[PDB]
Design a protein around this ligand. Structure first.
Ligand SMILES: NCc1ccc(Cl)cc1CNC(=O)[C@@H]1CCCN1C(=O)CNS(=O)(=O)Cc1ccccc1
Ligand SMILES: *[C@@H]1O[C@H](CO)[C@@H](O)[C@H](O)[C@H]1NC(C)=O
Ligand code: NA
Ligand code: NA
Lengths: 28, 11, 251
């Protein structure tokens, strides 16, 4: 709920997955 | 093709 | 998923597999939106042209998975369905308009490193992110090509396409309850959902709050990864009033 969309193995540890930056870069 | 799942879930 | 790659462990912890009891087989993708609710495509449960009309007892959901076929002991969790709810105006006759369904679990699933819910978009996040060129991510255990099957969960990032281009790619009547995504023939890169990916999530990571939102549900396409064709996704925000109604009155 309040914690939705924050992945334990990624956002919760401040680790990025290998391709999420591709998404960010498209958000112009 | 699928590995059998524990029976408890099919019961 | 066509032209994708193996998911990283815990990359899509809201990923759910819809699993047929007998014979034991993958039916569809789906997503975890809370400890008791799973979101999928209506056509995963009801599609008369293919003699499909599943009831609660026909199905299981498997959450926390990575391997397509293995029983992932100590990692995945398997849940029975209490109730299926299909959008009352789901159009299976024509074009899969409003292709959305909810499944309430008999018991809440425990969250873990591998199991965690995705957010549903508010109006503002949807307005900001649902724009042509902006990329989302699609995940599933469906076919690797149109005409085969992956060992583990597949992932592919795809750009949202301009609505006129979506419309002009197909003879199917497109509605405001759908959007399309994929690369154009010229762009070089490719990729698409395919059979078996149905019901899985199209997600975007908000650059405003760094949370993942489910903007779409894998719905339909003419073949898979065909040049000049696009994948069509249920517009989750447009149908959120229905989602909230169901959860508020049945949970
Ligand atoms: N075709 C594989 C594919 C490709 C892309 C995406 Cl996003 C989803 C999917 C999976 N979805 C499906 O396969 C769903 C299941 C019922 C019919 N269906 C289709 O995609 C049918 N596509 S179709 O025949 O070319 C055109 C069509 C679309 C809606 C209703 C009737 C016909
Ligand atoms: C599908 O299943 C339900 C319940 O078994 C049934 O009442 C309905 O008439 C069937 N066909 C549909 C919804 O098209
Ligand atoms: Na058209
Ligand atoms: Na295409």
């Amino acid at each position: 709920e309040a914690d939705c969309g924050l992945r334990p193995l990624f956002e919760k540890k401040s680790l990025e997955d290998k391709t999420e930056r591709e998404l960010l870069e498209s958000y112009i | 093709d699928f590995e059998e799942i524990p029976e408890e879930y099919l019961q | 998923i066509v032209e994708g790659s193996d998911a990283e462990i815990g990359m899509s912890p809201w990923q759910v597999m819809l699993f047929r009891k007998s014979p034991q087989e993958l039916l569809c993708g789906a997503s975890l939106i809370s400890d008791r609710w799973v979101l999928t495509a209506a056509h995963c449960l009801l599609y008369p042209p293919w003699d499909k009309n599943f009831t609660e007892n026909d199905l299981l959901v498997r959450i926390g998975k990575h391997s397509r076929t293995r029983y992932e002991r100590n990692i995945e969790k398997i849940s029975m369905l209490e109730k299926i709810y299909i959008h009352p105006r789901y159009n299976w006759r024509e074009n899969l308009d409003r292709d959305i369904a909810l499944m309430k679990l008999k018991k809440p699933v425990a969250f873990s490193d591998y199991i965690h819910p995705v957010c549903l978009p508010d109006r503002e996040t949807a307005a900001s992110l649902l724009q042509a060129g902006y990329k989302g991510r699609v995940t599933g255990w469906g076919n690797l090509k149109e005409t085969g099957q992956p060992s583990v969960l597949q992932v592919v990032n795809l750009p949202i396409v301009e609505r006129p281009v979506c419309k002009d790619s197909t003879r199917i009547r497109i509605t405001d309850n759908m959007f399309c995504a994929g690369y154009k023939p010229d762009e070089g890169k490719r990729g698409d959902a395919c059979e078996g990916d149905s019901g899985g999530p199209f997600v975007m990571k908000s650059p405003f709050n760094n949370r993942w939102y489910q903007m779409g549900i894998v719905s339909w396409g003419e073949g898979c990864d065909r040049d000049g064709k696009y994948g069509f996704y249920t517009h989750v925000f447009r149908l959120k009033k229905w989602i909230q109604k169901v959860i508020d009155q049945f949970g």
